[PDB]
Amino acid sequence: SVVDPSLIERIIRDDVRAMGAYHVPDSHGLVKLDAMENPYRLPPALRSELAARLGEVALNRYPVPSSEALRAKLKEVMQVPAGMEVLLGNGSDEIISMLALAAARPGAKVMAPVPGFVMYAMSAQFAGLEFVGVPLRADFTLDRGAMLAAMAEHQPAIVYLAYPNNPTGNLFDAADMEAIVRAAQGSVCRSLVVVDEAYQPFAQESWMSRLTDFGNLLVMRTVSKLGLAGIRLGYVAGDPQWLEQLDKVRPPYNVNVLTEATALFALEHVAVLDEQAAQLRAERSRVAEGMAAHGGVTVFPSAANFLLARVPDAAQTFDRLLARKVLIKNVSKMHPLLANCLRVTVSTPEENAQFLEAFAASLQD
Amino acid sequence: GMSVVDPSLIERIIRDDVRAMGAYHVPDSHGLVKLDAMENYRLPPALRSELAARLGEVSSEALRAKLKEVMQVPAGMEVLLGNGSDEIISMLALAAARPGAKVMAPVPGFVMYAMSAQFAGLEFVGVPLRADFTLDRGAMLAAMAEHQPAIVYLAYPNNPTGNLFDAADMEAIVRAAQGSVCRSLVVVDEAYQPFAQESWMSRLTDFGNLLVMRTVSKLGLAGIRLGYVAGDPQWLEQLDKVRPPYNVNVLTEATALFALEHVAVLDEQAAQLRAERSRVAEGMAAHGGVTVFPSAANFLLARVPDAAQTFDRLLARKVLIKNVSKMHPLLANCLRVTVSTPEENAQFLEAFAASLQ
């Protein structure tokens, strides 16, 4: 090796080098419950129908998925209110970046609760805008007064609210959020408020209908990738006066055809996707109950496909789980309020049962 | 009111220049011969069904191993996978997005070097190429000395100019970025390099601040090409920390593996490109006032008397090429034309000839 390690130290962000193995190698029997992903596969009948449709779209056998058709289907399926426009993207990150870029005015700031979605290189993930993180309460609830005070002091351009939040899992108090949306219209500050529902499972309480009630609100979501890897379709709904501006800063590339065809298929099989969501809800409860039954464990409330839990010793529990071929996410070092916290992704019944046993054993000192 | 948009709030939040821009209107390319994009198809029946089978049935390890084998990634170097060169360029910008971190590239260059920097909130330093689009070593080194960039992109060959920069100049740049002039990661972007050409891959052994970026052919299928970056694990282990889980679609990977297992087909693609690119270049250069610039890529850059007029006339004749005229002073009156199938190339040269009269 002819690498100069001091050059790597100089070029790569300290927070990127600080992080440990974001991806660990796929060994024999390793159960991964560390990533934002849905382990559930479709029924064989739907799997082969999707494989057929994507294969045909790949080989130019089936027709091109029209963006106008995909947007129209989203509006219908997602009950986008009358008068509101939908804008498509390559995942939620592109849409967040487009938003930040559209608002990249001299001195523009982005404000979001912390610990929150963008856990590293925040300003970088918000087109160079200054990031202002407002701590959530110790129990991860949104601190209305703290948000309002920071809003008054800092005068942000954009307020981002993850609904549910990553890594904490919780849906913030709806009243507190409405107060924030109204405050940002002028009385406290002047901001676009973006409710990010990217970690929200299908057929759940959405802010989509609140687009009718607030002129400074945008609601962003994603469509399932249906276990084929790749890029989830991202989308943002809101008033044409906001979206028409946002669409001018799109990167020099469109949304790829497989993502569009896959998202279309997802939208056309909502009954099946509702079934998965229900099965995951039942499994999340069993996993939460199992973890919660132990001494010194706090399982925090969750509306997501993952659970955050505080344990006596996260570093120790992580290693002991990995020693039993179970990989979860240690979020302990990402923020002071996440001290001794692990984030477990809800998986299949078989994998959940393996996690629960390994978790129970790892906690014994 | 509470429920209605405040147009002064739009004015306060959204950039003045974005509001001044016209709306994004998606143009229909229906009925047009499209020679404005970075695409090559022509796959035979037997392979098309074999590929169809593979995609019907559908391991990143297996793909990563086959990439290293076929592309002869040097011993000790690893590969990181992504969605085209685009995702890799974005990941690099994010991983290197420290305060004051600058991205540098010779200009005119691929729009994503500057764009990736803008999206990551990083300054971009364009260093002009010479009027003939050759790399200016002296300019590059002075720029590096002055600005101290974090990343330097050296395309091989360059988009939209098509040419391969001087190898000695490039090596000088890579070595200067090790500490003598500045301290930068130098990425050789081989995304536009056809198969079976001179590559920087083997030089990963010689330079510790070098990464080599490439794509695999998608065999003319619709969608994304597999993109990958080869280099030392100490670099790639850090870049892997911003790679999203399951970032690449299984069909993208399947097609990439199918292509890496049918190298002879990639060789035949390369051979047909050499022939057709010579044909198109000659046909264009025959016209008075037309300068075709040298290329080792899937497209040709040409300067015409009036690019706006030639573009409109070609479009009126149902042929779409890329008007890069306004994208850099050095591209004044330049059009970038993608080399395609014999039939499409014939239609282009027919339309091009009629549009110049």
From Swiss-Prot, chain A:
SUPFAM superfamilies: PLP-dependent transferases. Belongs to the class-II pyridoxal-phosphate-dependent aminotransferase family. Histidinol-phosphate aminotransferase subfamily. It comes from Cupriavidus pinatubonensis (strain JMP 134 / LMG 1197) (Cupriavidus necator (strain JMP 134)). Homodimer. The gene is hisC2. The modification N6-(pyridoxal phosphate)lysine is found at residue 225. It is an enzyme of class 2 (transferase). The lineage of its organism: Bacteria, Pseudomonadati, Pseudomonadota, Betaproteobacteria, Burkholderiales. GO terms for biological process: L-histidine biosynthetic process. Disulfide bonds: none annotated. It comes from the Bacteria. Pathway: Amino-acid biosynthesis; L-histidine biosynthesis; L-histidine from 5-phospho-alpha-D-ribose 1-diphosphate: step 7/9. Keywords: Amino-acid biosynthesis, Aminotransferase, Histidine biosynthesis, Pyridoxal phosphate, Transferase. Its EC number is 2.6.1.9. It catalyses: L-histidinol phosphate + 2-oxoglutarate = 3-(imidazol-4-yl)-2-oxopropyl phosphate + L-glutamate. CDD domains: AAT_like. Its cofactor is pyridoxal 5'-phosphate. GO terms for molecular function: histidinol-phosphate transaminase activity; pyridoxal phosphate binding. PANTHER family: HISTIDINOL-PHOSPHATE AMINOTRANSFERASE (PTHR42885:SF2), HISTIDINOL-PHOSPHATE AMINOTRANSFERASE-RELATED (PTHR42885). This is Histidinol-phosphate aminotransferase 2. Pfam families: Aminotran_1_2.
